Structure formats: structure tokens, C-alpha cells
Coordinates of C-alpha atoms and ligand atoms in Angstrom, one line a residue:
Chain P
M1 CA -151.9 69.6 195.4
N2 CA -152.3 72.9 197.3
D3 CA -150.4 74.5 194.3
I4 CA -152.5 73.0 191.5
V5 CA -155.5 74.2 193.5
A6 CA -154.2 77.6 193.8
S7 CA -153.2 77.9 190.0
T8 CA -156.8 76.9 189.0
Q9 CA -159.5 79.4 188.3
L10 CA -162.3 77.0 187.9
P11 CA -162.3 73.4 188.2
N12 CA -161.4 71.4 185.0
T13 CA -164.1 68.6 184.2
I14 CA -165.0 66.1 181.6
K15 CA -167.1 68.9 180.0
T16 CA -164.4 71.5 179.9
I17 CA -161.7 69.0 178.9
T18 CA -163.8 67.9 176.1
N19 CA -164.3 71.3 174.8
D20 CA -160.6 72.0 175.0
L21 CA -160.0 68.9 173.0
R22 CA -162.5 69.8 170.4
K23 CA -161.1 73.4 169.9
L24 CA -157.7 72.0 169.7
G25 CA -158.9 69.7 166.8
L26 CA -159.6 66.2 168.2
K27 CA -162.6 64.8 166.7
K28 CA -164.9 61.6 166.3
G29 CA -163.3 58.7 164.4
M30 CA -159.7 59.8 164.6
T31 CA -156.7 57.7 165.5
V32 CA -154.6 59.3 168.3
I33 CA -151.8 58.4 170.6
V34 CA -151.7 60.4 173.8
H35 CA -149.1 61.4 176.2
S36 CA -149.9 63.5 179.3
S37 CA -149.1 65.1 182.4
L38 CA -152.1 65.2 184.7
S39 CA -150.9 68.1 186.9
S40 CA -150.1 70.3 184.0
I41 CA -153.8 70.7 183.2
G42 CA -154.6 72.2 186.7
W43 CA -157.1 70.8 189.2
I44 CA -159.6 68.4 187.7
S45 CA -162.8 67.1 189.2
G46 CA -162.1 63.3 188.9
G47 CA -158.4 63.5 188.1
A48 CA -157.2 60.7 185.8
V49 CA -160.6 59.2 185.2
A50 CA -161.9 62.6 183.7
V51 CA -159.2 62.8 181.2
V52 CA -159.9 59.5 180.1
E53 CA -163.6 59.7 179.7
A54 CA -163.2 62.9 177.8
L55 CA -160.7 61.5 175.4
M56 CA -163.2 58.6 175.0
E57 CA -166.3 61.1 174.6
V58 CA -164.4 62.9 171.8
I59 CA -162.9 60.0 169.8
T60 CA -165.7 57.5 170.5
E61 CA -165.7 53.9 169.6
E62 CA -165.5 54.6 166.0
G63 CA -162.2 56.5 166.7
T64 CA -158.9 54.8 168.4
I65 CA -156.9 55.9 171.3
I66 CA -153.4 54.6 172.1
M67 CA -150.9 55.1 174.9
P68 CA -147.5 53.7 175.8
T69 CA -147.7 51.2 178.6
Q70 CA -143.8 50.7 179.0
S71 CA -142.6 48.5 181.9
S72 CA -138.8 49.1 182.0
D73 CA -138.6 47.6 185.5
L74 CA -138.6 44.3 183.7
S75 CA -135.4 45.0 181.8
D76 CA -132.0 43.5 182.1
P77 CA -130.3 45.4 184.9
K78 CA -126.9 45.2 183.1
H79 CA -127.8 48.5 181.2
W80 CA -129.6 50.2 184.1
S81 CA -128.6 53.9 184.5
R82 CA -131.5 56.0 185.9
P83 CA -130.9 54.3 189.2
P84 CA -128.2 51.6 188.8
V85 CA -127.5 48.4 190.9
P86 CA -124.6 46.1 192.1
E87 CA -123.6 43.1 189.6
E88 CA -124.2 40.5 192.3
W89 CA -127.9 41.6 192.0
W90 CA -128.2 41.2 188.2
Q91 CA -128.4 37.4 188.0
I92 CA -130.7 37.2 191.0
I93 CA -133.0 39.8 189.2
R94 CA -132.9 37.8 186.0
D95 CA -133.9 34.6 188.0
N96 CA -136.8 36.3 190.1
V97 CA -138.4 39.3 188.5
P98 CA -142.0 38.4 187.8
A99 CA -143.0 37.8 184.1
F100 CA -144.8 40.4 182.0
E101 CA -148.7 40.0 182.1
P102 CA -150.7 42.5 180.1
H103 CA -153.6 42.8 182.7
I104 CA -151.2 42.8 185.7
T105 CA -147.8 44.5 185.0
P106 CA -147.8 48.1 186.1
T107 CA -146.3 50.7 183.9
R108 CA -143.4 52.9 185.0
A109 CA -142.7 56.6 184.0
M110 CA -146.1 56.7 182.0
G111 CA -148.4 58.5 184.4
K112 CA -151.7 58.1 186.2
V113 CA -153.5 58.8 183.1
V114 CA -152.0 55.7 181.5
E115 CA -152.5 53.6 184.5
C116 CA -156.2 54.5 184.5
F117 CA -156.5 53.9 181.0
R118 CA -154.9 50.5 180.7
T119 CA -157.4 49.0 183.3
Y120 CA -160.4 50.4 181.5
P121 CA -162.8 47.5 180.0
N122 CA -162.5 47.0 176.3
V123 CA -158.9 48.6 176.5
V124 CA -156.5 45.9 175.2
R125 CA -152.7 45.8 175.7
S126 CA -149.8 44.5 173.3
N127 CA -147.7 41.7 174.2
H128 CA -144.3 43.4 174.7
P129 CA -142.6 42.9 178.2
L130 CA -140.8 46.2 178.0
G131 CA -142.4 48.6 175.3
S132 CA -146.2 47.5 175.3
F133 CA -148.9 49.8 174.2
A134 CA -152.5 49.9 175.2
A135 CA -155.4 50.9 172.7
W136 CA -159.2 51.4 172.8
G137 CA -161.7 51.6 170.0
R138 CA -162.0 50.9 166.4
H139 CA -158.5 49.6 165.5
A140 CA -157.5 48.7 169.2
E141 CA -157.2 45.1 167.9
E142 CA -155.2 45.7 164.8
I143 CA -152.8 48.3 166.4
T144 CA -151.8 46.1 169.5
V145 CA -151.7 42.7 168.1
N146 CA -148.6 40.7 167.0
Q147 CA -145.9 43.1 168.4
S148 CA -142.4 41.5 167.7
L149 CA -140.1 40.9 170.6
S150 CA -137.0 42.4 168.9
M151 CA -137.3 46.0 167.5
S152 CA -140.0 46.9 170.1
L153 CA -140.6 50.3 168.3
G154 CA -140.0 49.2 164.6
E155 CA -142.0 48.3 161.6
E156 CA -143.9 45.4 163.3
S157 CA -145.0 47.7 166.3
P158 CA -148.0 49.7 167.0
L159 CA -146.1 52.9 166.0
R160 CA -146.1 51.6 162.4
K161 CA -149.7 50.5 162.5
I162 CA -150.6 54.3 163.6
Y163 CA -148.4 55.4 160.7
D164 CA -150.3 53.4 158.2
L165 CA -153.7 54.7 159.7
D166 CA -152.4 58.2 159.3
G167 CA -153.0 59.0 162.8
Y168 CA -152.2 61.7 165.3
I169 CA -150.1 62.3 168.3
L170 CA -151.5 64.3 171.1
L171 CA -149.1 65.7 174.0
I172 CA -150.8 67.1 177.0
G173 CA -148.4 69.2 179.2
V174 CA -145.4 67.2 177.9
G175 CA -142.7 67.8 175.2
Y176 CA -140.9 65.8 172.5
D177 CA -138.9 63.8 175.2
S178 CA -142.3 61.8 175.9
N179 CA -143.1 61.4 172.2
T180 CA -142.6 57.7 171.7
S181 CA -143.5 57.7 167.9
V182 CA -140.1 59.2 167.2
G183 CA -138.5 55.8 168.1
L184 CA -139.7 54.7 164.7
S185 CA -137.7 57.5 163.3
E186 CA -134.7 56.1 165.2
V187 CA -135.4 52.8 163.7
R188 CA -136.0 53.9 160.3
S189 CA -132.7 55.8 160.3
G190 CA -130.5 53.5 162.1
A191 CA -130.0 56.2 164.7
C192 CA -128.7 53.9 167.6
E193 CA -126.7 50.9 168.2
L194 CA -128.3 47.4 168.8
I195 CA -127.9 45.8 172.0
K196 CA -128.6 42.3 173.2
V197 CA -131.5 42.7 175.9
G198 CA -133.6 40.5 178.0
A199 CA -137.0 40.4 179.9
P200 CA -139.2 37.7 181.5
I201 CA -142.3 36.4 179.7
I202 CA -144.8 33.6 180.2
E203 CA -143.7 30.9 177.7
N204 CA -146.2 28.0 177.9
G205 CA -147.6 29.3 181.2
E206 CA -144.0 29.1 182.3
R207 CA -141.9 32.0 183.4
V208 CA -138.9 32.4 181.1
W209 CA -136.1 34.9 180.8
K210 CA -136.0 35.7 177.2
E211 CA -133.0 37.1 175.6
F212 CA -133.4 39.1 172.3
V213 CA -132.2 42.2 170.6
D214 CA -133.4 46.0 170.4
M215 CA -132.2 49.5 169.6
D216 CA -130.4 51.5 172.5
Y217 CA -133.3 54.0 172.0
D218 CA -132.6 57.6 173.0
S219 CA -135.0 60.3 173.6
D220 CA -132.1 62.8 174.2
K221 CA -132.4 64.3 170.8
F222 CA -136.1 64.3 170.6
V223 CA -136.6 67.7 172.1
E224 CA -134.0 69.1 169.4
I225 CA -135.9 67.6 166.7
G226 CA -139.2 68.8 168.1
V227 CA -137.9 72.4 168.1
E228 CA -136.8 72.2 164.5
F229 CA -139.8 70.2 163.3
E230 CA -142.1 73.0 164.7
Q231 CA -140.4 75.6 162.6
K232 CA -142.6 74.2 159.6
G233 CA -145.8 75.3 161.5
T234 CA -147.6 72.1 161.1
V235 CA -148.4 71.6 164.7
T236 CA -151.5 72.7 166.4
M237 CA -151.1 74.4 169.8
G238 CA -153.7 75.2 172.6
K239 CA -154.5 74.9 176.1
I240 CA -156.3 72.0 178.0
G241 CA -157.0 73.9 181.4
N242 CA -153.3 75.3 182.2
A243 CA -151.5 72.7 179.9
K244 CA -149.7 73.7 176.7
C245 CA -150.8 70.9 174.4
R246 CA -149.9 69.8 170.9
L247 CA -151.6 68.0 168.0
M248 CA -149.8 66.8 165.0
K249 CA -150.0 64.1 162.3
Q250 CA -147.7 61.2 163.3
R251 CA -146.5 60.7 159.7
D252 CA -145.4 64.2 159.8
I253 CA -143.0 64.1 162.9
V254 CA -141.9 60.5 162.1
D255 CA -140.9 61.4 158.5
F256 CA -139.2 64.7 159.8
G257 CA -137.3 62.5 162.3
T258 CA -136.2 59.9 159.9
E259 CA -134.7 62.6 157.6
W260 CA -133.3 64.5 160.5
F261 CA -131.3 61.5 162.0
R262 CA -129.8 60.7 158.5
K263 CA -128.7 64.3 157.9
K264 CA -126.3 63.8 160.8
Chain B
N1 CA -133.1 61.0 195.3
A2 CA -135.6 58.2 196.7
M3 CA -135.1 55.3 194.3
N4 CA -131.4 55.9 194.8
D5 CA -131.8 55.8 198.7
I6 CA -134.0 52.8 198.8
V7 CA -131.4 51.0 196.6
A8 CA -128.4 52.1 198.9
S9 CA -130.3 51.1 202.2
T10 CA -130.7 47.5 200.8
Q11 CA -128.3 44.5 201.3
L12 CA -129.8 42.1 198.8
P13 CA -132.8 42.6 196.8
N14 CA -136.4 41.5 198.1
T15 CA -138.1 39.0 196.1
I16 CA -141.2 37.1 196.0
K17 CA -139.3 34.3 197.6
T18 CA -137.7 36.6 200.4
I19 CA -140.9 38.4 201.1
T20 CA -142.8 35.0 201.4
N21 CA -140.2 33.9 204.0
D22 CA -140.5 37.0 206.1
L23 CA -144.3 36.7 206.0
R24 CA -144.4 33.1 207.2
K25 CA -141.7 33.7 210.0
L26 CA -144.0 36.7 211.1
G27 CA -147.0 34.3 211.3
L28 CA -149.0 34.7 207.9
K29 CA -150.2 31.2 207.0
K30 CA -152.4 29.3 204.5
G31 CA -156.2 29.7 204.9
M32 CA -156.0 32.9 206.9
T33 CA -158.1 36.0 206.6
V34 CA -156.0 39.2 206.4
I35 CA -156.5 43.0 205.8
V36 CA -153.3 44.3 204.7
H37 CA -151.9 47.9 204.7
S38 CA -148.5 48.7 203.3
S39 CA -145.8 51.3 202.3
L40 CA -143.9 49.7 199.5
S41 CA -140.8 51.6 199.9
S42 CA -140.5 50.8 203.5
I43 CA -139.5 47.2 202.6
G44 CA -136.4 48.2 200.7
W45 CA -135.8 47.4 197.1
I46 CA -137.8 45.0 195.6
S47 CA -137.4 43.0 192.3
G48 CA -140.9 43.4 190.7
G49 CA -142.2 46.2 193.1
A50 CA -145.9 45.9 193.9
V51 CA -146.5 42.8 192.0
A52 CA -143.9 40.9 194.0
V53 CA -145.6 41.9 197.2
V54 CA -149.0 41.0 195.8
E55 CA -147.9 37.5 194.6
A56 CA -146.0 37.0 197.9
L57 CA -149.3 37.5 199.7
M58 CA -151.2 35.3 197.6
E59 CA -148.6 32.5 197.8
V60 CA -148.8 32.4 201.5
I61 CA -152.6 32.9 202.1
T62 CA -153.6 31.0 198.9
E63 CA -157.1 30.7 197.2
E64 CA -158.2 28.8 200.6
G65 CA -157.4 32.0 202.5
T66 CA -158.7 35.6 202.0
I67 CA -156.8 39.0 201.5
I68 CA -158.5 42.3 201.9
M69 CA -157.3 45.9 201.3
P70 CA -159.1 49.1 201.6
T71 CA -159.7 50.7 198.2
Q72 CA -160.8 54.3 199.3
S73 CA -161.6 56.8 196.8
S74 CA -162.2 60.1 198.6
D75 CA -161.6 62.1 195.5
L76 CA -165.3 61.5 194.9
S77 CA -166.7 63.0 198.2
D78 CA -168.5 66.5 198.9
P79 CA -166.0 69.1 198.6
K80 CA -167.9 71.2 201.4
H81 CA -165.8 69.1 203.7
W82 CA -162.5 69.1 202.1
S83 CA -159.5 69.9 204.3
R84 CA -156.5 68.3 203.4
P85 CA -156.5 70.4 200.1
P86 CA -159.5 72.8 200.1
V87 CA -161.6 74.3 197.3
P88 CA -163.7 77.5 196.8
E89 CA -167.4 77.3 197.2
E90 CA -168.1 78.5 193.5
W91 CA -166.5 74.9 192.6
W92 CA -168.5 72.9 195.1
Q93 CA -171.7 72.8 193.1
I94 CA -169.7 72.4 189.8
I95 CA -167.9 69.2 191.3
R96 CA -171.1 67.6 192.5
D97 CA -172.5 68.1 189.0
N98 CA -169.4 66.8 187.1
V99 CA -167.2 64.6 189.1
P100 CA -167.4 61.0 187.5
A101 CA -169.5 58.4 189.3
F102 CA -167.8 55.5 191.0
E103 CA -167.1 52.3 189.2
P104 CA -165.5 49.4 190.9
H105 CA -163.3 48.2 188.1
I106 CA -162.5 51.9 187.1
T107 CA -162.2 54.4 189.9
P108 CA -158.7 54.8 191.0
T109 CA -157.8 54.8 194.8
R110 CA -156.2 57.7 196.6
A111 CA -153.9 57.4 199.5
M112 CA -153.8 53.7 199.5
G113 CA -150.5 53.0 197.8
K114 CA -149.2 51.1 194.6
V115 CA -149.6 47.8 196.5
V116 CA -153.5 48.6 196.5
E117 CA -153.6 49.9 193.0
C118 CA -151.9 46.7 191.8
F119 CA -154.0 44.3 194.0
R120 CA -157.3 45.9 192.8
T121 CA -156.6 45.1 189.2
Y122 CA -155.7 41.6 189.5
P123 CA -158.1 39.1 188.2
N124 CA -160.4 37.3 190.6
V125 CA -160.0 40.2 192.8
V126 CA -163.5 41.7 193.7
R127 CA -164.2 45.3 194.9
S128 CA -167.2 46.4 197.0
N129 CA -169.7 48.7 196.0
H130 CA -169.0 52.0 198.3
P131 CA -168.1 55.2 196.2
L132 CA -165.8 56.5 199.0
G133 CA -164.9 53.6 201.5
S134 CA -164.9 50.6 199.2
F135 CA -162.6 47.6 199.9
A136 CA -161.2 44.9 197.7
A137 CA -160.8 41.2 198.4
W138 CA -159.3 38.0 196.9
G139 CA -159.8 34.3 197.8
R140 CA -162.0 32.1 199.8
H141 CA -164.3 34.9 201.4
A142 CA -163.8 37.5 198.7
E143 CA -167.4 37.6 197.7
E144 CA -169.0 37.4 201.3
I145 CA -166.7 40.1 202.6
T146 CA -167.2 42.7 199.8
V147 CA -170.8 42.2 199.0
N148 CA -173.9 44.4 200.1
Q149 CA -171.9 47.4 201.6
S150 CA -174.5 49.8 202.9
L151 CA -174.1 53.4 201.6
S152 CA -174.6 55.0 204.9
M153 CA -172.2 53.9 207.8
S154 CA -169.4 52.9 205.4
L155 CA -167.3 51.2 207.9
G156 CA -170.1 49.9 210.2
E157 CA -171.9 46.7 210.9
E158 CA -173.0 46.3 207.3
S159 CA -169.3 46.7 206.1
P160 CA -166.4 44.5 205.2
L161 CA -164.8 45.4 208.5
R162 CA -167.6 43.5 210.2
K163 CA -167.4 40.5 208.0
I164 CA -163.6 40.4 208.8
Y165 CA -164.5 40.6 212.6
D166 CA -166.9 37.7 212.3
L167 CA -164.5 35.5 210.5
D168 CA -161.9 36.3 213.4
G169 CA -159.5 37.5 210.9
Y170 CA -156.3 39.4 211.0
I171 CA -154.8 42.8 210.3
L172 CA -151.3 43.1 208.7
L173 CA -149.3 46.4 208.8
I174 CA -146.2 46.6 206.6
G175 CA -144.2 49.7 207.2
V176 CA -147.2 51.7 208.4
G177 CA -148.7 52.5 211.9
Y178 CA -152.1 52.6 213.4
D179 CA -153.1 55.7 211.4
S180 CA -153.4 53.5 208.4
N181 CA -155.4 50.9 210.4
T182 CA -158.7 51.0 208.9
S183 CA -160.5 48.4 211.0
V184 CA -160.4 50.8 214.1
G185 CA -163.0 52.8 212.4
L186 CA -165.5 50.2 213.3
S187 CA -164.5 51.0 216.9
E188 CA -165.5 54.5 216.3
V189 CA -168.8 53.2 215.1
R190 CA -169.4 51.0 217.9
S191 CA -168.4 53.6 220.4
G192 CA -170.2 56.6 218.7
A193 CA -166.8 58.4 218.8
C194 CA -167.5 60.8 216.0
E195 CA -170.5 63.1 215.1
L196 CA -172.7 62.1 212.0
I197 CA -172.7 64.2 208.9
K198 CA -174.6 64.6 205.8
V199 CA -172.2 63.6 202.8
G200 CA -172.4 62.8 199.2
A201 CA -171.0 61.1 196.3
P202 CA -171.6 60.1 192.6
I203 CA -172.8 56.8 191.7
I204 CA -174.4 54.8 188.7
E205 CA -178.1 54.5 189.5
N206 CA -179.8 52.7 186.6
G207 CA -176.8 53.2 184.1
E208 CA -177.4 56.8 185.1
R209 CA -174.9 59.1 186.9
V210 CA -176.6 60.3 190.1
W211 CA -175.3 62.6 192.8
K212 CA -176.4 60.7 196.1
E213 CA -176.6 62.3 199.6
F214 CA -176.4 60.0 202.6
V215 CA -175.2 60.0 206.0
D216 CA -171.9 58.9 207.7
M217 CA -169.6 59.2 210.6
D218 CA -166.8 62.0 210.5
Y219 CA -164.2 59.2 210.9
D220 CA -161.0 60.6 212.5
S221 CA -157.8 58.5 212.5
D222 CA -156.3 61.1 214.8
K223 CA -156.3 59.0 217.9
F224 CA -155.6 55.7 216.3
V225 CA -151.9 55.9 216.9
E226 CA -152.6 56.6 220.6
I227 CA -155.0 53.8 220.7
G228 CA -152.3 51.6 219.1
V229 CA -149.7 52.5 221.6
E230 CA -151.8 51.6 224.5
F231 CA -153.1 48.5 222.9
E232 CA -149.8 47.2 222.3
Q233 CA -149.0 47.4 226.0
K234 CA -150.9 44.1 226.3
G235 CA -148.3 42.4 224.1
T236 CA -150.7 40.6 221.7
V237 CA -149.1 42.0 218.5
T238 CA -146.5 39.9 216.5
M239 CA -143.6 42.1 215.3
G240 CA -141.1 41.5 212.7
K241 CA -139.4 42.6 209.5
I242 CA -140.3 42.3 205.9
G243 CA -137.1 43.4 204.4
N244 CA -136.3 46.8 206.3
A245 CA -140.0 47.4 207.2
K246 CA -141.2 47.1 210.8
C247 CA -144.3 45.0 210.4
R248 CA -147.3 44.0 212.8
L249 CA -149.8 41.2 212.8
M250 CA -152.6 41.1 215.2
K251 CA -156.2 39.6 215.5
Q252 CA -158.7 42.2 214.1
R253 CA -161.3 41.3 217.0
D254 CA -158.5 42.2 219.5
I255 CA -157.7 45.9 218.2
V256 CA -161.5 46.6 217.4
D257 CA -162.5 45.7 220.9
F258 CA -159.9 47.4 222.6
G259 CA -160.6 50.4 220.4
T260 CA -164.4 50.4 221.2
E261 CA -163.6 50.3 224.8
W262 CA -161.1 52.9 224.7
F263 CA -163.1 55.4 222.9
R264 CA -165.9 55.0 225.6
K265 CA -163.7 55.4 228.6
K266 CA -163.4 58.8 227.3
Ligands
ACO1 C1 -138.9 57.8 174.6 C2 -140.5 57.5 175.2 O1 -141.3 57.1 174.6 S1 -140.8 58.3 176.6 C3 -142.2 57.5 177.3 C4 -143.6 58.2 177.0 N1 -143.9 58.8 178.1 C5 -145.1 59.4 178.3 O2 -146.0 59.3 177.3 C6 -145.3 59.8 179.6 C7 -145.3 61.4 179.5 N2 -145.6 62.3 180.7 C8 -144.7 62.6 181.6 O3 -143.5 62.3 181.4 C9 -145.1 63.3 182.7 O4 -144.1 64.3 183.0 C10 -145.1 62.3 183.9 C11 -146.4 61.6 184.1 C12 -143.9 61.5 184.0 C13 -145.1 63.4 185.2 O5 -146.3 64.1 185.1 P1 -147.1 64.2 186.5 O6 -148.2 65.3 186.3 O7 -145.9 64.7 187.5 O8 -147.6 62.9 186.8 P2 -149.1 62.2 186.5 O9 -149.6 62.7 185.1 O10 -148.9 60.8 186.7 O11 -150.2 62.7 187.5 C14 -150.0 62.5 188.8 C15 -150.1 63.7 189.5 O12 -151.3 64.6 189.2 C16 -151.6 65.2 190.4 N3 -153.0 65.2 190.7 C17 -153.6 64.2 191.5 N4 -155.0 64.4 191.5 C18 -155.3 65.5 190.6 C19 -156.4 66.1 190.1 N5 -157.7 65.9 190.4 N6 -156.2 67.1 189.2 C20 -155.2 67.6 188.8 N7 -154.0 67.0 189.2 C21 -153.9 66.0 190.2 C22 -150.7 64.8 191.5 O13 -149.9 65.8 191.6 C23 -150.1 63.6 191.0 O14 -148.8 63.5 191.6 P3 -148.4 62.5 192.8 O15 -148.6 61.0 191.9 O16 -146.9 62.8 193.1 O17 -149.7 62.7 193.7
ACO2 C1 -158.0 55.1 209.0 C2 -158.0 54.6 207.5 O1 -158.8 54.2 206.8 S1 -156.5 55.0 206.7 C3 -155.4 53.9 205.9 C4 -155.9 53.3 204.5 N1 -154.8 53.4 203.7 C5 -153.8 52.6 203.8 O2 -153.7 51.6 204.4 C6 -152.5 53.1 203.2 C7 -151.3 52.5 203.9 N2 -150.0 53.1 203.5 C8 -149.4 54.5 203.7 O3 -150.3 55.0 204.4 C9 -148.2 54.8 203.2 O4 -147.9 56.0 203.7 C10 -148.4 55.3 201.7 C11 -148.8 54.1 200.9 C12 -149.5 56.4 201.5 C13 -147.2 55.9 201.2 O5 -146.1 54.9 201.2 P1 -145.0 54.9 199.9 O6 -144.0 53.6 200.4 O7 -144.4 56.2 199.9 O8 -145.6 54.5 198.6 P2 -146.3 53.3 198.1 O9 -146.7 52.4 199.1 O10 -147.3 53.8 197.0 O11 -145.0 52.7 197.4 C14 -144.6 53.3 196.2 C15 -143.2 53.9 196.3 O12 -142.2 52.9 196.5 C16 -141.0 53.1 195.8 N3 -140.9 52.1 194.7 C17 -141.1 51.9 193.4 N4 -140.4 50.6 193.0 C18 -139.9 50.1 194.0 C19 -139.2 48.8 194.3 N5 -139.0 47.9 193.3 N6 -138.8 48.5 195.5 C20 -139.0 49.5 196.4 N7 -139.6 50.7 196.3 C21 -140.2 51.0 195.1 C22 -141.6 54.5 195.1 O13 -141.1 55.7 195.8 C23 -142.9 54.6 195.1 O14 -143.5 56.0 195.3 P3 -143.2 57.1 194.0 O15 -142.9 56.1 192.9 O16 -144.7 57.7 193.9 O17 -142.2 57.9 194.4
CL3 CL1 -157.4 59.4 162.1
CL4 CL1 -170.6 47.7 221.7

């Protein structure tokens, strides 16, 4: 916090952030999926809330804002790597981990900006226990509704609805390893193996541990993809405060990513 | 490596069930009024994290009891007085003109913890109207406790601390000490322990952002830990473990009355 204060000349505000966003190319009526690091911007008067109102101010109710709202805490611990756990636990976890509930389940590894956004009124969340998304504005409903359990990031997912709407991805202080849209590139190219997975859901107002199948998604290659993608000079770059940001068409990068994965 | 440590220091995973046992053996029970302060990590590894702890509390207290937690948002306060991290005066007036108004369902808390962030978003959980020192509550007296908080004297005789007092309710500390024990700020108000300062914050007055100036105590938890140590000598605090976390259950009137008397004796 001390550092963030020191590295900032004047405070970022809803107004400054809003300028920065417009200079960069965000505009009224656009569809955008947003990924962010709050600290990278520098000190902000209002933190997470300011970044959310600024996005809202620029895009407006006639535009649409989406953000990933992933809750991997709820996943089968068999496959747990980041931190791992003893096999005696596994079956206890499956039998006791609380079911997914849109309004309730916290995100993990998404950031304060996402935590703040998902609790806003009129912001709606998709129905996936592990790979949900939240959306606001004009196509909120259409984007978040009827996500399939299997293939969370596939052709029945919000990623594809953003694709069909020819929308944009915005990266604030983060690189391609956070660019969830490229998962759809994975699916479309068959980049990863399938695995049997599970999660807890409310089936008939009744907790149930549901097994189903998904890709072993891997953002390991995303950064590489992004570097080679940017050689085409189709990404807009500029600062929000101190943060290096990026604005691109989602179709652009998803299509590049599909072709890239195949070329291997 | 923290998540790693927490896992390593845990024998079997904490769950809604285990946490609920521990609460009951400690003395939490149906129909009780309780203000809860916590460190999630202190418990050890929990299947479901914050959500587990929240459900466990509801499971024990039930809709016939009441749960309260502080939902403070000091981010929104006049930067003149900022100490923890400070900011150049050139900013100060900009901050007052631009920092977003408080909104109960919107404004994140600062320094309260994941358990509070999770709690305040639960349905049926209602939050008081203060832009800096709000509280959130659930169950039988949720409404009565959180309603009509005065601007000035946030933690005073028009605050939720007092409503908890009148109800003869409890304080629960999970993995945290008396420096987190917000109730004692009533003791401060009752005893006149701190100076009064002209403060401000941004509110929605008529669907309209307004910077409001008003007056409060310069509240100081610096002495709480000392107060707590001397308080516990009377042996009226119940102690026990939730997972790995050393916990404490006491009657709020007990500690607030001791605290009022303590502060005066000086
Ligand atoms: C394959 C896939 O799809 S990947 C999943 C998609 N992922 C995403 O979209 C998330 C992408 N973002 C990231 O990965 C980021 O690196 C993060 C969020 C993980 C980490 O970024 P951070 O800035 O460290 O975290 P975050 O954005 O939550 O903001 C919190 C930090 O901002 C800082 N902060 C607090 N208040 C303020 C303020 N007023 N002004 C500026 N900074 C502040 C604090 O440092 C805080 O950290 P703390 O929680 O340790 O106090
Ligand atoms: C006088 C007054 O009015 S002041 C007091 C008002 N405030 C309060 O009552 C707050 C009381 N609590 C405190 O003071 C504590 O020190 C805190 C909350 C500030 C810090 O406690 P922590 O345990 O570090 O954090 P918190 O309670 O948010 O728990 C989240 C942490 O638990 C850990 N965690 C995450 N998942 C799990 C899990 N399944 N199991 C266990 N731990 C987990 C993580 O470290 C997380 O922190 P990070 O993810 O940011 O690294
Ligand atoms: Cl668009
Ligand atoms: Cl008195």
C-alpha cells in the first residue's frame, strides 16, 4: 500500500480512469470482457468500486461488461496441484464442500475488481460451479444464461456468446495468462485432454456432487500465443494510471489461438 | 507459501460440521445474539473457506438468533487524518471531491476479512447506514440492530453496539485478540477516552453524491489488548478451539462495562 502510494503522482479516480478508458478505445454500447489487477493502476480513490463505476460509466447499460467469476475451490481435489492435499481428504471434501450458489460463492484468483463487480445490483452470474462468468448491461442475460456443465469454456459458454457479438477483451495490468477467452481457442483446436471432473451443485434445492467432463485447460501457452499474436499489430495499448493495458477484438485472438494450437 | 502452510498445519479438514461442533462445545447456541470477529487462516484448512464459517454460524444461531459483524469502510474517510498509509495534501481535496459515495450493498469493507466480505453479501443480511463504521446483521434482530445509526458518534449510544448491549448479547473472537474487539469503542465513548474530531465521508443525499462533514471520536484500539488482558483476570471469558484457532466467548456488557470503568480509572 505504501509503495502504490509512492509510485503515484496524483490519485486515480472514477473521472481519470474514465478518460483513460475512452482514450484507449472503450466506448458506449460496446461488449467487453475485462481482466484486471487493481494495484497495477496505482493508488485509486475508491479502489475496486471506482474501477467498476468507470467501466459502467463508459460502456453504459446499452453496452455489456463481462468478467470471469471462477471458483476452483469447489473442484475435485484429485487434480489439485497449485496447493495439493492428502488422498484421505479427497472423499471428505467431495461429501462436505458447500454447493455453488451464484449470489453466495466467492471467486478465487479473480481479484477485488471481480469480487466487487459480481455483487453489484443488476449484475447477473452464470450457472457454472467452477467456470462461471458475471455480466452487466444490454446482453447480460443472453451471455450468462444456459451455460453447459461439461465444456465450461466451449461453444455453449459465455465465451462463444461474446464471440458472436463480436466483442472485445480488455486487459488492465495483466497479460495473456489471464485472458480466459483463449480457452475457447483450446476447445476449438482440441489442445488439451479431456478429464472426468466434479463439483457440488444445488439439484432440487438439494446439495449434489455432480461428475461431468471438461478439458484440462492450460494457460501455460497463452503468454506465448499473445506475444506472437501481437506481432500483427491489432492490439491497442495504453495506460490506465500506471497500468499497461490492452484492447483487442475477442474474435481476433480466439481465431489466432485456434490456428496457433493446430499448427503444433 | 501460506496456503501450503495452512494445509501442512492441519490434521483433518475443517468443515461446516466440525466448525459447528466446535462452536457448540465453546458455548454458541440457538437464539443467541453474537458479534463475531475472525481470522479465517487461524482456523486451519477449511473445506469451503469463508462460506463454511458463515453457514456454520447460521446453523448454530439460527434465524431465531442474531449474528452481527463490523463492516467498516475506512477507505472512504477524510485523508487529512490518514496515517496507516498517508497521502500528499494536493490529493486531499481531490479525494473529497471524487471518492465514491457509500452504498450498503456495494461498498467493500477494508480490514474486516473474507468472512465479513462473504457474510455481507448473503441474502437476508442487512447492513447499517454508516459510510465509515457500518455493521451487518442477520436473523431475529437484524433490522433492530442495524437501523437508524447516527452519523456522528458512529460507535455510540445510537449505534449497533448499544443495541447489542441492550440485548445482553455476546462477542465471539476467532483467532483474533482484543485489538479487533469493536465493542470496546463504546467503552471509549462512555468514558470520554478520546478527543472529538471533525471528520467527513461521502454519502448519497437525495440520489446525489455529497461530501458530508460531521464529528466523531478519534477511536483508538491501542489500549484494547491491555484492557483485555486485565479483563480476563476475572475469569469470565470462555476459551476453546475452532480448528487451530484460539477463540473467546464473552458477554458484551461484561467487557464494555469493564472497559468504561478501566478508561476512567486513568
Ligand atoms: C485461464 C484463465 O482464465 S485465468 C483466470 C482469469 N483471471 C483474471 O481475469 C484475473 C486476472 N488478474 C490477475 O491475475 C491479477 O494478477 C490478480 C488479481 C490475481 C492479482 O492482482 P493484484 O492487484 O495483486 O490483486 P487485486 O486486483 O485483487 O487488487 C487487490 C490489491 O490492490 C491493492 N489496493 C487496495 N486498495 C487500493 C486502492 N485504493 N488503489 C490501488 N490499489 C489498491 C492492494 O494491494 C490489494 O491487495 P491485498 O488484497 O493484498 O491488499
Ligand atoms: C477496534 C475495531 O473496530 S477493529 C476490528 C474490526 N475488524 C475485525 O474484527 C477483523 C478481525 N480480523 C482480523 O483482524 C484479522 O487479522 C484479518 C482478517 C485482518 C486477517 O486475517 P487473515 O486470516 O489473514 O485473513 P482473512 O480473515 O481475510 O482470511 C483470508 C485468508 O485465509 C486464507 N484462506 C483462504 N482459503 C482458505 C481455506 N479454505 N482455509 C483456510 N484458510 C484459507 C488466505 O490466506 C486468506 O488470505 P489471502 O487469500 O488474502 O492470502
Ligand atoms: Cl461491441
Ligand atoms: Cl457511564
